[PDB]
Amino acid sequence: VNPTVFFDIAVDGEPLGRVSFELFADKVPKTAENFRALSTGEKGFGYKGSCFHRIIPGFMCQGGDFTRHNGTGGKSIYGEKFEDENFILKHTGPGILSMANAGPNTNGSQFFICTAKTEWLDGKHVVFGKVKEGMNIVEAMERFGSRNGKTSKKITIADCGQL
Amino acid sequence: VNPTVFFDIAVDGEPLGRVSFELFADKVPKTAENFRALSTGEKGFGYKGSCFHRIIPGFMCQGGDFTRHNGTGGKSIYGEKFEDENFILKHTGPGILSMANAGPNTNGSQFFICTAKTEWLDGKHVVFGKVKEGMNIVEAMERFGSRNGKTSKKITIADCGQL
Amino acid sequence: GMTEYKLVVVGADGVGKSALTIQLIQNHFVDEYDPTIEDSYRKQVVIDGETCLLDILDTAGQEEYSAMRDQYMRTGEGFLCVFAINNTKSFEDIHHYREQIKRVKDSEDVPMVLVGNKCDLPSRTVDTKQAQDLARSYGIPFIETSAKTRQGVDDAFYTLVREIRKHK
Amino acid sequence: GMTEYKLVVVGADGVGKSALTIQLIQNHFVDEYDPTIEDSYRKQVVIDGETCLLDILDTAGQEEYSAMRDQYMRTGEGFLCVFAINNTKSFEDIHHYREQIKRVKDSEDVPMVLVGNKCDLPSRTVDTKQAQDLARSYGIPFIETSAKTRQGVDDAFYTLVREIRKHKE
Ligand SMILES: CCn1c(-c2cc(N3CCN(C4CC4)CC3)cnc2[C@H](C)OC)c2c3cc(ccc31)-c1csc(n1)C[C@H](NC(=O)[C@H]1[C@@H]3COC[C@@H]31)C(=O)N1CCC[C@H](N1)C(=O)OCC(C)(C)C2
Ligand SMILES: CCn1c(-c2cc(N3CCN(C4CC4)CC3)cnc2[C@H](C)OC)c2c3cc(ccc31)-c1csc(n1)C[C@H](NC(=O)[C@H]1[C@@H]3COC[C@@H]31)C(=O)N1CCC[C@H](N1)C(=O)OCC(C)(C)C2
Ligand SMILES: Nc1nc2c(ncn2[C@@H]2O[C@H](COP(=O)(O)OP(=O)(O)O)[C@@H](O)[C@H]2O)c(=O)[nH]1
Ligand SMILES: Nc1nc2c(ncn2[C@@H]2O[C@H](COP(=O)(O)OP(=O)(O)O)[C@@H](O)[C@H]2O)c(=O)[nH]1
Ligand SMILES: [Mg+2]
Ligand SMILES: [Mg+2]
DSSP: OOOEEEEEEEETTEEEEEEEEEEOTTTOHHHHHHHHHHHHTTTSOOSTTOBOOEEETTTEEEEOOOSSSSSSOOOBBTBSOBOOOOOOSOOOSTTEEEEOOSSTTOBOSOEEEESSOOGGGTTTSOEEEEEEEOHHHHHHHGGGOOTTOOOSSOEEEEEEEEO | OOOEEEEEEEETTEEEEEEEEEEOTTTOHHHHHHHHHHHHTTTSOOSTTOBEEEEETTTEEEEOOTTTSSSSOOOBTTBSOBOOOOOOSOOOSTTEEEEOOSSTTOBOSOEEEESSOOGGGTTTSOEEEEEOSOHHHHHHHGGGOOTTOOOSSOEEEEEEEEO | OOEEEEEEEEOOTTSSHHHHHHHHHHSOOOOSOOOOSEEEEEEEEEETTEEEEEEEEEEOOOGGGTTTHHHHHHHOSEEEEEEETTOHHHHHHHHHHHHHHHHHHTSSOOSEEEEEEOTTSSOOSSOHHHHHHHHHHHTOOEEEOBTTTTBTHHHHHHHHHHHHHHHO | OOOEEEEEEESSTTSSHHHHHHHHHHSSOOOSOOOOSEEEEEEEEEETTEEEEEEEEEEOOOGGGGGGOHHHHHHOSEEEEEEETTOHHHHHHHHHHHHHHHHHHTOSOOOEEEEEEOTTOSOOOSOHHHHHHHHHHHTOOEEEOOTTTOTTHHHHHHHHHHHHHHHHO
16 A cells, blocks of 8 residues: 655744645555655655745745755665666646656656646656645745745755655 | 054964054044954953954955854953944945944944945944054955855955054 | 736835735744845735735835835836834835836836735824824825734735826 | 856756856865755956956756746846757757747847866867857857866856957947
């Protein structure tokens, strides 16, 4: 049965709330397991303490660079990057959890959470999960974003794990 | 005699270099003395450790808020605020050191360093000194500014005193 | 895609434009005075059932720069004109703000909303009555707000979007 | 006051638009790849003994968003058209960018400079004379640069300012 993971979000160190995600291991097992393992830290590295570096109101919240903390880094549990698993699932609306990349077959650890339907990303980013609880936390994170994604506060994954 | 003070500037904790200022005590003694004493910290508080919170390339670098460290605070050695001492000196070019304010007779501790002539400030901000050595460092601080003054790195006065 | 709306907030300084804008955007109240250079914000909202993106330009009311105020006046589609109900001066400044906006846009009716802010204060120098009689002359809505308690914030900007929609 | 020049850096992603811009503004070399959404920068410089203010817009080349380039091209005063000298496709992309700037500005006479970047690299696929002939046929200057070594970085941005002045008279 599909695993469930959570992030505890903080804003300049102050608790905001918990968001949890269902990961669609039934449809993208490789991509789901990467995200699961990075949320638990079990490989010795992962999301805990990393930031949401890019937040663009009306579109999405992006994070997952835990190696450089500047938006350029991140790595998967399979190597620095891994191939696109499939594009079965689409960016249908708010709450979709999907992989960031720099072109074909460059998945690492960065990911984004849609706050709107982003249909033009279909076939280009691997969708592998969706928000289960705490979509209002993701909505609240938009208050700290901007047109080019620069954030006005430090938005962190203060804790994360598997439920 | 016009005293000289210095700021040692750091960028995200990294020493950048030293800017020294001649303070025009011979035209604005009360305003010069405030900045002198805040640069030594001899009254129990002052500039050491504060940041340059607004840098607008082509115009000026502004700092001096050591009470709130967010651009709204600061205080003089004479109490909360003090009067505009006079407007004898003008914003004639790069290097001019002048007082920030929020209207007439609201000088506290915040100041700015011109990187260009800003003559539309004449008669509204009290000029009280000029960069003596280290203009190249004020210029390098403009690397980290923006059109509305938000800085892209933390620009601090790591040390300061009187020469 | 959702439709985007470019709004512009104006008024003399100290009235609470940024505290109103920041209340709309971040639901937080700034009790400290931080006079504005220029700030832009984006927020998605639903107004009368339609999701849209607000792009809000928060401006400075320094008189030395009133010349350059023309430029954003070109790009803006609607204007929240803020005064403070304990500051008669900022109320008299409103007329000047209206005249210039009507100039730069070259129309008599620009999408526009008058805002009397700080209505939490026990002091008042601008009666509700005065601001109603002014707003009625111009033919635009009037709303009293309080950034401090958040009264009327959303109404001001949505009404403004609803004035842009009605003239769009 | 000093005159302000609105410069816009365009080209396929990965050619070095942002690395050139960050060298100009901050005098160091971004080795990492941070594909751009949109960024703006300000720098005062002396060009021909005249201090001026450069306003630089660093743009996204993402092809999915090619039809959204229009607003920034309308406001920009001159354009650095950048390709990488080890990427023939980025050179071919140049035509599409120039055409689009002309089509959006509705003018055959728009201040532009052709920039061949990464000239520190050994794996060159675009001849210098091939880029020169092209620049000549456009009627614009051509400058080879390296954001890594700083070769030509000032020359490229200063030459575009000089093209804007010429167009302005
Ligand atoms: C043209 C402006 N503009 C927009 C955009 C577009 C639109 N229209 C409106 C109309 N609509 C049509 C009716 C449908 C289309 C969209 C409106 N307004 C905007 C913005 C606000 O105008 C400034 C965007 C956008 C995106 C990019 C560049 C410019 C962009 C861009 C750069 S890099 C990338 N995109 C992929 C990026 N890669 C990396 O970060 C790599 C880094 C290194 O390796 C690991 C790591 C990545 O994976 N994601 C995860 C996925 C979302 C994606 N980022 C991102 O941020 O999208 C931003 C946004 C706003 C969704 C799109
Ligand atoms: C219109 C935009 N715009 C400009 C401006 C203007 C121009 N020109 C005007 C002149 N033309 C000449 C005839 C040709 C050419 C075009 C070009 N481009 C710009 C900018 C870059 O576009 C975004 C400015 C400017 C300044 C303000 C607001 C908006 C501004 C502003 C807000 S508050 C203040 N000013 C005084 C402030 N008070 C406090 O900070 C209080 C806080 C609380 O209590 C203690 C503390 C203070 O003392 N200073 C210390 C002094 C410099 C001053 N800040 C400041 O930052 O000036 C910025 C700047 C760029 C010099 C001027
Ligand atoms: N009592 C009260 N104070 C307010 C209100 N809105 C703003 N202020 C205060 O007024 C001062 C100026 O606010 P600010 O938003 O910077 O005004 P602006 O210059 O017009 O942007 C600050 O100290 C604010 O906290 C309000 O509704 N009620
Ligand atoms: N060797 C070399 N690498 C460069 C040069 N300019 C950019 N790069 C690298 O090329 C990649 C893309 O650079 P970037 O500035 O992000 O390109 P952009 O997409 O056009 O903005 C990054 O790895 C840079 O480090 C250059 O002049 N020489
Ligand atoms: Mg304000
Ligand atoms: Mg770039």
